[PDB]
Design a protein around this ligand. Structure first.
Ligand SMILES: COc1ccccc1CC(=O)N1CC[C@@H](NC(N)=O)C1
Ligand SMILES: [Zn+2]
Length: 140
């Protein structure tokens, strides 16, 4: 589990969105595993606007933050899970790092701010849904 709180937005994995998220929906995209809902309180996270390929992510199954090198956002085939059939996911970045299904939502960050959230993984890989192209998260 986990979310990014930026401005009056909450960014979560689409597959973990709550009824309150759907009833306060701003934007969602199944092909990216992302959903954004509105919030009453202002958040403290800032979004990175950069091309970093190194950062640090939070892994709940280890209660630890790990440094990682990650690929550029791409279209990658993701295996079937309890939440999606096997399909192509867009804007996904892969890295070598531990992950388990419930690690989705952990933040990946660089020196510039939040880069994305854990979305996929297995066998010593972890995949992150990028958010750096969503420029509208920084305004209104
Ligand atoms: C972090 O995911 C894993 C880690 C280790 C093993 C297996 C997984 C995959 C998994 O169970 N998934 C459930 C949510 C689905 N998200 C998506 N964007 O398709 C991925
Ligand atoms: Zn950066």
């Amino acid at each position: 589990s986990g979310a990014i709180y930026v401005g009056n937005y909450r960014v979560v994995n689409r597959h973990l969105a709550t009824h309150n998220d759907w009833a306060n929906l701003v934007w969602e995209d199944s092909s990216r595993d992302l959903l954004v809902s509105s919030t009453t309180a202002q958040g403290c996270d800032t979004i990175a606007r950069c091309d970093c390929q190194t950062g640090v992510y939070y892994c709940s199954s280890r209660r630890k933050h790990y440094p990682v090198s990650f690929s550029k956002p791409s279209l990658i085939f993701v295996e079937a899970s309890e939440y999606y059939p096997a399909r192509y996911q867009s804007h996904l970045m892969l890295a070598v790092g531990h992950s388990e299904p419930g690690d989705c939502g952990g933040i990946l960050r660089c020196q510039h701010g939040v880069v994305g959230i854990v979305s996929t993984g297995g066998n010593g890989l972890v995949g992150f849904a990028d958010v750096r192209d969503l420029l509208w998260l920084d305004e209104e």
